[PDB]
Design a protein around this ligand. Sequence first.
Ligand SMILES: Cc1cc2nc3c(=O)[nH]c(=O)nc-3n(C[C@H](O)[C@H](O)[C@H](O)COP(=O)(O)OP(=O)(O)OC[C@H]3O[C@@H](n4cnc5c(N)ncnc54)[C@H](O)[C@@H]3O)c2cc1C
Ligand SMILES: Cc1cc2nc3c(=O)[nH]c(=O)nc-3n(C[C@H](O)[C@H](O)[C@H](O)COP(=O)(O)OP(=O)(O)OC[C@H]3O[C@@H](n4cnc5c(N)ncnc54)[C@H](O)[C@@H]3O)c2cc1C
Ligand code: HEM
Ligand code: HEM
Ligand SMILES: CC(=O)N1CCN(c2ccc(OC[C@@H]3CO[C@@](Cn4ccnc4)(c4ccc(Cl)cc4Cl)O3)cc2)CC1
Ligand SMILES: CC(=O)N1CCN(c2ccc(OC[C@@H]3CO[C@@](Cn4ccnc4)(c4ccc(Cl)cc4Cl)O3)cc2)CC1
Lengths: 403, 403
Amino acid sequence: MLTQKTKDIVKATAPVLAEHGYDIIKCFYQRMFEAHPELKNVFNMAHQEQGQQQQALARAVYAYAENIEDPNSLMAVLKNIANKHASLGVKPEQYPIVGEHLLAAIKEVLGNAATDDIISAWAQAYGNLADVLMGMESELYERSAEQPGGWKGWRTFVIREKRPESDVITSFILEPADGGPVVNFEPGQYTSVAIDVPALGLQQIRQYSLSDMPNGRSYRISVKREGGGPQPPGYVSNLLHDHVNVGDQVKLAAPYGSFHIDVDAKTPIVLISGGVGLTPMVSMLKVALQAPPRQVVFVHGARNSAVHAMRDRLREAAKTYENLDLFVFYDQPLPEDVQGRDYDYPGLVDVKQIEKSILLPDADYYICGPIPFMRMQHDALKNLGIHEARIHYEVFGPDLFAE
Amino acid sequence: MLTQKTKDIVKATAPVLAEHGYDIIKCFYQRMFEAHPELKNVFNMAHQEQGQQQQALARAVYAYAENIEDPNSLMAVLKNIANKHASLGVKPEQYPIVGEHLLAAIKEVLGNAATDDIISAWAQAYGNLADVLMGMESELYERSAEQPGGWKGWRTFVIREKRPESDVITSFILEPADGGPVVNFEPGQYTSVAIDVPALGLQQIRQYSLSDMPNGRSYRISVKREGGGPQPPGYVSNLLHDHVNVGDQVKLAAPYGSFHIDVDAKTPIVLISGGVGLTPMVSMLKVALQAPPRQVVFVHGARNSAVHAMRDRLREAAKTYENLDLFVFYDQPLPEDVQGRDYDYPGLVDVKQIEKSILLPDADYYICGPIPFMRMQHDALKNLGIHEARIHYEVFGPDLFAE
Ligand SMILES: Cc1cc2nc3c(=O)[nH]c(=O)nc-3n(C[C@H](O)[C@H](O)[C@H](O)COP(=O)(O)OP(=O)(O)OC[C@H]3O[C@@H](n4cnc5c(N)ncnc54)[C@H](O)[C@@H]3O)c2cc1C
Ligand SMILES: Cc1cc2nc3c(=O)[nH]c(=O)nc-3n(C[C@H](O)[C@H](O)[C@H](O)COP(=O)(O)OP(=O)(O)OC[C@H]3O[C@@H](n4cnc5c(N)ncnc54)[C@H](O)[C@@H]3O)c2cc1C
Ligand code: HEM
Ligand code: HEM
Ligand SMILES: CC(=O)N1CCN(c2ccc(OC[C@@H]3CO[C@@](Cn4ccnc4)(c4ccc(Cl)cc4Cl)O3)cc2)CC1
Ligand SMILES: CC(=O)N1CCN(c2ccc(OC[C@@H]3CO[C@@](Cn4ccnc4)(c4ccc(Cl)cc4Cl)O3)cc2)CC1
């Protein structure tokens, strides 16, 4: 447990770590992978190139520092991390590994300025956080293992169906190879797919929102095929699209995540999604429409009808349920897309154009999409007078990028 | 923080670690020193061929496991370890190093039996303990640094005086090379000498009780020359006797230890020492005899007059102070030692032979000597009806050997 002086050295040196974040990260991964190459099967090797983990580092240290005196704030962010670590299968025996190489990297990068006081302060911070996280993770693993259909580690699933939703999104319906039950989850949570990537010669692991309601038998994910454009195609999404077919197997983690509706709440929900960001929203939509009403406004932004996932099922739902309001925004509508017919508004989701429809008293707001889209929606909701406690979000990259 | 299920795996598998302690200890040091040979400057390299560490490991894992549900019992022993680690200069950044190699060793020795559940439980135990220890050690370093004449790390001292006390015990009076004040200590506390051992080509560190009262200028240690007999001579004790002379320099730690008198207490103290175990007792004697009386019974066992340290000063004190009773037992008296004249009783310290003299109401008892001697005295004091809360001891090896 940290003394005041130790917290103060952390506060004082957080900017020093942040502005050297690039070199510390590079040195950290080089050291750590030289000593433990097997860990490349757990880390993302695509992010291993790009900015950008350096952005997240800077944000972590700065958020750690500004919150080191506020254990409640600290516990909440740690929960997001523990959930993500549990999904990846992070093990207690890995904390000393990561800790040594992280400290060796800080030491190397800071050179002469890596004084005993600084290294010692951060080494203590590291051990404090590690203890909190290992215990959270352990609790998460045990709760999953003990529930009906629950497990620890990887469980083999088989693809039962694979249904294209648009030119870029495809849904995979997944049942366990063993034919047994599958643990429940809160709508909004995710699984992780761990699969071998022959281009890399390594396993990679990626999270996917559980895009259907819980049913005890199967899970559904909806995977957007990534990239080409100007930048490299993504490893796992293309691999799932092109090489994982009906009857093939993948390994899945038990559901985790702290982004989810409270299923027991009477109160309204507003679901604001950009592109593939709709995936947790659909799960939330389908559970909420179990009356208990509850009142759902589904707000979705997509480029056009060619990329809009689950177009038909969503409008059919809005014709059938009183408590659902559907608003679709097309940013670049196709010649055959017509406003007021195939979608409601042109351009990006704009909350002012549906203000009365979304300002439901007692409402919780959920937001998922690219980070610029998320910050835009976040700011707009604040401008209406909605309290931050009522705004929730899940990132399709690192959860610390728009904090 | 540990879940019930994690503590349960610890409780169930302690015996497995204890049974394999020998191999785990051998593998742990091999791995650790291969990766960080510099740590050989901090560990004792007379573990050359020593099971002393396997004994202590087996006791630690069993004591830890049996107490894991009682945090108060756990905190108290962790204080003894924190004080010893602080004396050694153990650094927060070394916790991930020890943790990794310890876990790697547990994994290699247990082989097939190192299941995920077991490795995970002990890894969490390791991190939980590491956090508590680092925080205690940091608090200890800061308190020392902030006090008049205190410091962190090594401070250079010069031997001002070197006085033989018997054929085997020599005192060293030490003042700081910088000429500044030295920090106060509680009587019974120790320093650590760190010194280069050329036979080893390494620094070695040994604790020595501070054998005089605090005075703001100097420290005194009294060092028994170890070995020859049948076993190898001790490195540091022979080195100090033969090559550290007046004017030479050694490095010392600030005082630590949880074995000491309460200087502010009115109540009586009984001081039971075997051989070199008298050294903290003398400090405690000299402070207590500052009236505030307090009432001191100094009970000492030594083989004979040739080996009895500080013989003349102790009897002279007993002639001068009303509130001091002196009892000397010689186990193997020399022809020229006469009972009733040069010592009070033949044989080992036996408390029944001075029962009325030691059964002072409200008394605290302090015991220091070889472990068999300490258990003997401990048991005897219990048989008189003294509460365990009133019996204190400090070990000249590992503090967990007679718990
Ligand atoms: C909680 C959570 C839930 C998620 N839910 C979903 C979901 O429901 N549906 C879904 O499709 N995704 C979801 N994701 C995203 C998903 O996990 C993967 O990130 C996504 O499928 C891309 O994985 P990949 O292996 O295909 O791409 P990677 O190979 O890992 O590449 C990552 C991205 O970086 C780009 N890139 C790669 N290399 C470079 C480079 N050198 N320079 C610049 N750019 C580069 C790629 O084009 C790609 O867009 C979720 C993520 C999280 C954290
Ligand atoms: C809290 C504390 C306070 C202490 N206070 C004092 C004090 O006031 N005065 C004092 O003199 N000592 C004190 N000690 C003991 C002291 O710390 C040293 O342990 C002592 O001087 C021996 O160190 P050494 O380097 O000479 O022996 P080491 O070289 O460390 O060897 C340790 C012992 O093992 C034996 N040994 C070495 N090799 C072998 C072998 N391979 N096989 C079998 N046996 C072997 C040696 O003969 C020696 O006695 C204290 C210890 C503690 C923990
Ligand atoms: C106290 C120590 C640790 C801290 C503070 C920490 C913190 C973080 C943070 C802030 C994130 C980003 C969270 C997100 O995705 O939303 C993260 C992700 C991640 N962590 Fe840790 N962590 C620690 C230890 C570990 C350990 C021991 C491992 C085991 C290998 C680990 C492996 C990972 C991986 C694989 C990711 C996802 C990043 C990626 O996609 O490559 N972390 N952790
Ligand atoms: C959770 C982690 C740790 C635990 C539970 C632990 C526990 C202990 C215990 C029980 C002892 C015996 C104390 C004695 O001498 O009587 C000890 C001693 C010691 N520890 Fe640790 N310790 C830990 C970490 C560390 C670290 C990180 C270092 C850094 C080098 C370290 C270095 C030492 C040294 C040098 C000794 C003295 C033993 C010797 O003389 O060789 N320990 N520790
Ligand atoms: C928007 C987008 O497309 N985005 C996708 C996700 N992309 C990303 C991937 C991983 C990531 O990770 C977070 C940071 C980065 O570095 C570590 C790695 N780490 C360490 C322990 N557990 C994880 C770290 C953590 C704490 C400490 Cl103190 C030190 C370190 Cl070096 O976390 C950060 C970002 C970045 C790009
Ligand atoms: C006189 C002599 O010749 N002798 C005197 C006694 N001297 C001694 C040295 C070490 C010792 O050890 C106690 C325990 C047992 O072994 C470790 C080593 N260790 C680890 C961290 N700090 C020390 C240990 C501790 C905690 C954990 Cl979780 C794991 C491990 Cl393996 O200490 C006990 C005694 C060795 C030399």
